[PDB]
């Protein structure tokens, strides 16, 4: 689950769905600023949606996000995966996953291409 407290703002957004939420706390977030957003861990595989139960619940702004390259959105929509642990996050990309990044250090071009074009995603770092 996901919810975002934005500044200013005395309610905050709660959804479901996890890569809603945080999509929202990324931009359509409108008219406060996102001051800190809370997700309810879980997921993992998901975060889907449907979820995979339940789980811990975390400041995904101060959190490991996994950007994942192999399945993702990419075309698409992109679905990021917010987890407390840095060690399950990278172990997603283990699997398939793609970068792990924190909610502070997410970037645009991991999580979409442009063009591809090479462009160094954050800094070729990652």
Same mark, same amino acid.
Not at 57 to 85: Q, T
Not at 93 to 104: C, D, F
């Given at each position: 689950?996901?919810? $975002? ?25 409108? $008219?406060?600023? $996102?001051?800190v957003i809370? @997700? ?9 949606? /449907?979820?995979?139960? /339940?789980?811990?619940?975390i400041a995904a702004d101060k959190a ?20 407390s642990?840095? /060690? ?14 924190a909610l502070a250090? $997410?970037? /645009? ?5 442009? @063009? ?11």
């Amino acid at each position: 689950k996901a919810q $975002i407290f934005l500044e200013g703002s005395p309610a905050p957004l709660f959804f479901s769905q996890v890569r809603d939420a945080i999509a929202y706390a990324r931009g359509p977030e409108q $008219i406060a600023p $996102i001051l800190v957003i809370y @997700v309810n861990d879980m997921g993992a595989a998901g975060a889907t949606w /449907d979820q995979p139960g /339940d789980g811990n619940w975390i400041a995904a702004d101060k959190a490991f996000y996994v950007v994942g390259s192999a399945r993702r959105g990419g075309m698409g929509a992109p679905e990021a995966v917010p987890f407390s642990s840095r /060690d399950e996050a990278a172990a997603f990309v283990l699997a398939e996953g793609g970068q792990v990044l924190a909610l502070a250090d $997410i970037t /645009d071009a991991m999580v979409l291409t442009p @063009v591809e074009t090479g462009s160094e995603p954050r800094a070729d770092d990652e």
